[PDB]
């Protein structure tokens, strides 16, 4: 629900700002607004 300023976006911003860890490149199905490679994103409120 509202993945921009909530769970998904919150986790992404946290790992990007604090830990400096690209989790978006890990959650994808490949080794090499949110665009995850292989998996889709649905905004429930939209």
């Amino acid at each position: 629900f509202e993945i921009h300023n909530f769970s998904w976006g919150y986790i992404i911003e946290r790992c990007q700002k604090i830990h400096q860890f690209d989790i978006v490149r890990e959650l994808a199905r490949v080794k090499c607004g949110i665009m995850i490679t292989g998996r889709h994103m649905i905004n429930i409120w939209r």
């Binding site: 490949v30 080794k31 090499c32 889709h40």
Partner: protein, 352 residues
């Protein structure tokens, strides 16, 4: 009896040309530096997510022909010249002409325009590109007249690469991809955390034993490493895709054949067949639709003026002879050697 994969997600990337990718009709002496590969994230009917690497599928665009319809020799020279000029212009804009990186080959195919009433064969080119992301921009140059001296109309350029791929080969979204052969990658039982034993079952084992030989079907782990964080990943060739060959190609537009059928393209015909099967499931007897008899008139306010203008145009657009529905189209330019669009895509495939 066919290997089925669903189309849940599609993506394209660039890689070096391997033995499974084409590297060479316009300029065969010049190799390719980078070829595009399509990634299709699918799921087997058993429920296991699969990653597929599609090769050989290259974008293209058509333009108006320059020469005349009169020996299959000058066509190759013209195509090579056009390819060289396009490569030079692209390398000059984007900053012995070897190892082409933008254009792959240029061919000659016949066609019929769609924006207008044309009942005659027209010759077009086939500019096969390599990087689709810039391909549109390339057409912009062709639309700006920077490559050649005069401006040329662009044909089949607004359609993206993925759409052209899924259309050329009769595939749809969230549908099965019927294929009979494939090529395997690094060990099929991926062991990232537990996937090598937690997801394996009898159905997947049978599917593997039917399509995996482990002697000549698995690729080397040093040349084709696994880059997918899931189940087994396979590599597919355009010669193996069996989704095509089901379309019914028609050529009733090169001459007045209509002047002298209801089931159209699959996903509509497929839906109709599924509904007929549901009816045959003993739900009910039959489907029907009653027609209504109608009596059309349908003139308008400007009907007389339109008729007068049509008569004046027919008087103007006429030169002393009489037109016949059988003698209008000249019986010349057989165009038998020129390849049809749906007969030209099977070309440029590397080898078996």
């Amino acid at each position: 009896d066919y290997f089925r994969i669903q189309l849940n997600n599609q993506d394209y990337y660039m890689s070096k040309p391997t033995f499974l990718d084409p590297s060479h009709e316009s300029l065969p002496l010049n190799q390719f530096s980078q070829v595009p590969n399509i990634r299709v994230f699918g799921a087997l009917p058993t429920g296991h997510q699969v990653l597929c690497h599609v090769h050989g599928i290259l974008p293209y665009m058509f333009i108006k022909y320059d020469g005349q319809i009169t020996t299959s020799t000058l066509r190759h020279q013209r195509c090579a010249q056009v390819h060289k000029t396009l490569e030079v212009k692209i390398r000059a804009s984007f900053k012995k002409l070897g190892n082409l990186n933008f254009v792959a080959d240029v061919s000659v195919v016949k066609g019929i325009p769609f924006y207008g009433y044309h009942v005659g064969w027209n010759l077009f080119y086939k500019i096969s590109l390599l990087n689709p992301s810039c391909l549109s921009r390339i057409s912009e140059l062709i639309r700006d007249g920077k490559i050649f001296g005069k401006k040329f109309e662009i044909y089949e350029s607004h359609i993206p690469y993925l759409l052209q791929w899924t259309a050329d080969f009769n595939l749809f979204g969230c549908s099965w991809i019927n294929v009979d052969r494939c090529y395997f990658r690094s060990p099929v039982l991926n062991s990232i955390l537990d996937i090598d034993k937690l997801t394996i079952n009898d159905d997947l084992q049978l599917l593997l034993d039917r399509f995996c030989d482990f002697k000549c079907n698995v690729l080397s782990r040093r040349d084709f490493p696994r880059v997918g964080n899931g189940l087994i990943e396979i590599d597919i060739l355009p010669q193996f895709i069996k989704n095509r060959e089901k379309l019914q190609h028609r050529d009733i537009h090169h001459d007045f054949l209509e002047k002298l059928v209801k089931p159209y393209v699959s996903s509509a015909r497929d839906m109709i067949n599924e509904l007929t099967m549901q009816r045959e499931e003993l739900s009910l007897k039959e489907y029907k639709e009653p027609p209504e008899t109608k009596r059309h008139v349908h003139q308008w306010q400007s009907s007389g003026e339109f008729e007068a203008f049509y008569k004046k145009a027919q008087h103007k657009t006429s030169t002393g002879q009489i037109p016949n529905f059988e003698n209008f189209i000249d019986k010349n330019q057989k165009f038998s050697a020129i390849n049809t669009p749906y007969e030209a895509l099977p070309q440029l495939w590397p080898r078996l």
